From Swiss-Prot, chain A:
Protein family: Belongs to the class-II aminoacyl-tRNA synthetase family.
Subunit and partners: Homodimer.
Result for mutant: residue 181 to A: In CMT2W; uncertain significance
Phylogenetic classification of the source organism: Eukaryota, Metazoa, Chordata, Craniata, Vertebrata
Effect in UniProt of substituting residue 98 to G: In CMT2W; uncertain significance; fails to complement deletion of the yeast ortholog; decreases histidine-tRNA ligase activity; increases in the KM for ATP binding; does not disrupt dimerization
Protein name (Swiss-Prot/TrEMBL): Histidine--tRNA ligase, cytoplasmic
Swiss-Prot record, chain B:
Self-association and partners: Homodimer.
Protein name per Swiss-Prot or TrEMBL: Histidine--tRNA ligase, cytoplasmic
Places the protein is found: Cytoplasm
One Gene Ontology CC term in the entry: cytoplasm
Domain of life: Eukaryota
Length: 434, 350
């Protein structure tokens, strides 16, 4: 029996937490800015509230009561939440850990306990207004994370269904083809079309009309050409998604995100799920944030079986975590794990108690202070501490520096001292720091 | 139906989160003031990790794999963490849910100093932090009863350890708001030194103590690590804070929206969408109703039942004069400002 965290899990270190924290803040400063409420749900649900999912699910023992299972997702509790409270409309974010008993990467990428960060807008509203706001939030959050330049790929579920019908894919073969054509952003058409014909058995004449569509991508100028596409122009499903997309584009221009988006017919994911728009944000590579509209899901716990038209986004905080901490190992830099702002020190040999008086004073003034938990600390060791923890200042008490009612404030980085009076010390610290 | 949150566990409504935020904010802002690091552990540990009243533990099935169990504690994982990274010195706070089977799923809020230091300076720190928080929470008044294990047993050093703790308490200004009690003994079998417990003056509000025996556990060399900590019963505190919030007539807001963008006339959705983004690009918590042609009364009612202090109205005659009408939901008085000053005008009133 080794001391270890269970297969697929991980402790968050003080360094990692410090990085994880600055990411969440930016993400939450944005959600709050859009007037979103927040809910929280328990870690486990009734074992069978989660039926109708892949059964890569942590199930608890019996141990007495009923059968239970750790949440593999945030949205099933969400749909349980809206039903247990009889809500037809809400705007929430929810940040918590989900549990999928899958095989942990060693390269890496995948964990069994990982953060999920979702934002949602449930309810019946005018067409694409809540759909357009979700894009604005991503681009706000991503741009504010300072992690490089990004693009948002956009597509509609109906344009997919219509395109595959008018091109001629069988419904039973419909969805391994989506799973295939979705690989276009990591691979090439040649290989897609090739993997394809070997595994599907589509007519090569079905594979290559798909290619004339899915290989295309661009802006609104594309959604207008696709309307002019004669065979698409008489597919009812394709015409809706195209309509809903032209409108969606018009709103983004008003948001000033018009160019940070690309309509990409190759995008085809989460089809158990999305019924309208589908979103995915990529860096400039890798999938960093997703989302879209899913109207037939949240209401699937309602008595009379009422739809709850819902749109929303998820953010790959786990991926963004890794990027930030390497962009802080890029400068090979100490991430500050504390917010300590002053260290009460002394060079003399019996002043321990006089320090304690000063720290509580600093504390009760709302200043983040600290002292070494020893009776006669040497000033050299005291300073290394600050240098290590990135503490900006040191407050040195001396006997003949106590006598005149003052305190020595030595800046750790500039090594410069200046005598400050007890009355002005806290003011000085609150100015030499934010 | 019979849609049910698992027995012993409840959800968190937007209003409940509001209290939770304000409470945790006070807690956290104090923990950082004392320069603490923060760690996190998995929600479960190995079954054997969580061994020595103790079959109160949530366990998982057989997976085909290991035998896991949910954390009944925040301190046993602290122990495992220290033995694993091999640390003899750390100061950390941890806010996380625990999973006792008996609520069943509830929050815990530990702050622990670990290491070899001169007498009862860290032990005094914890008490100062406890008083710092209970005061700032503003939940009435409180007292802290203090004790020592070794006294309850040799019963001469706890007398002297406590003798040495009180002057530090005096230097901090905490001497008064604590008390000595010999009956306070629980909990008492992982503890080795001081044992305290917070009590509100009108419960289990806050407790903890010193325990040098609970990190030498997993350490295979058996080298014990001294550790003093505390835990704040943040669940009871959650209820009291709102109970008092409700007793103050005041609305507990669930959002932080400061301005709603409205219009009384028709065909002005586009012009509204443009404006809110400007408010958003400036970091103002603004909002907009997802209607093509909403009515100005419905939006004003949305505001007063949310706590939004302001409304930004757009009309074609305001639209054209470079002017934007700003009405205050409460006083219902009106100003119109040029588009430029608006982003700053709003920040002024909030």
């Amino acid at each position: 029996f080794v001391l270890k965290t269970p297969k697929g899990t991980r402790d968050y270190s003080p360094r990692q937490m410090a990085v994880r924290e600055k990411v969440f803040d930016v993400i939450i400063r944005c959600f709050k800015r859009h007037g979103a409420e927040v809910i929280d749900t328990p870690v486990f649900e009734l074992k069978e509230t989660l039926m109708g999912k892949s059964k890569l699910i942590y199930d608890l023992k019996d141990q007495g009561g009923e059968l239970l299972s750790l949440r593999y997702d945030l949205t099933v509790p969400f749909a349980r939440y809206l039903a247990m409270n009889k809500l037809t409309n809400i705007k929430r974010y929810h940040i918590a850990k989900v549990y999928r008993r899958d095989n942990p990467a060693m390269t890496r990428g995948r964990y069994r306990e990982f953060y999920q960060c979702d934002f949602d807008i449930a309810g019946n509203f005018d067409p694409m207004i809540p759909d357009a706001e979700c894009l604005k939030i991503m681009c706000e959050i991503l741009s504010s994370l300072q992690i490089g330049d990004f693009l948002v790929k956009v597509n509609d579920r109906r344009i997919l269904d219509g395109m595959f019908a008018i091109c001629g894919v069988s419904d039973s073969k419909f969805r391994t083809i989506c799973s295939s054509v979705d690989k276009l952003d990591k691979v090439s058409w040649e290989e897609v079309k090739n993997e394809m014909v070997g595994e599907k058995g589509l007519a090569p004449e079905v594979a290559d009309r798909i290619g004339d569509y899915v290989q295309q991508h661009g802006g609104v100028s594309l959604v207008e050409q696709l309307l002019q596409d004669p065979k698409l122009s008489q597919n009812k499903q394709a015409l809706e998604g195209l309509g809903d997309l032209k409108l969606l584009f018009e709103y983004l221009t008003l948001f000033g995100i018009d160019d940070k988006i690309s309509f990409d017919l190759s995008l085809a994911r989460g089809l158990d799920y999305y019924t309208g728009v589908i979103y995915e944000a990529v860096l400039l590579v890798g999938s960093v944030a997703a989302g879209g509209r899913y109207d037939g899901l949240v209401g699937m716990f309602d008595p009379k079986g009422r739809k709850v038209p819902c749109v929303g986004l998820s953010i790959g905080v786990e991926r963004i975590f890794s990027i930030v901490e390497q962009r802080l190992e890029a400068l090979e830099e100490k991430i500050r794990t504390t917010e300590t702002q002053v260290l009460v020190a002394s060079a003399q040999k019996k002043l321990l108690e006089e320090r304690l008086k000063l720290v509580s004073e600093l504390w009760d003034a709302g200043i983040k202070a600290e002292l070494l938990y020893k009776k006669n600390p040497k000033l050299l060791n005291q300073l290394q501490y600050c240098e290590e923890a990135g503490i900006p200042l040191v407050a040195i008490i001396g006997e003949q520096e106590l006598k005149d009612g003052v305190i020595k404030l030595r800046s750790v980085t500039s090594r410069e001292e200046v005598d400050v009076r007890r009355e002005d010390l806290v003011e000085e610290i609150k100015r030499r720091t934010g």
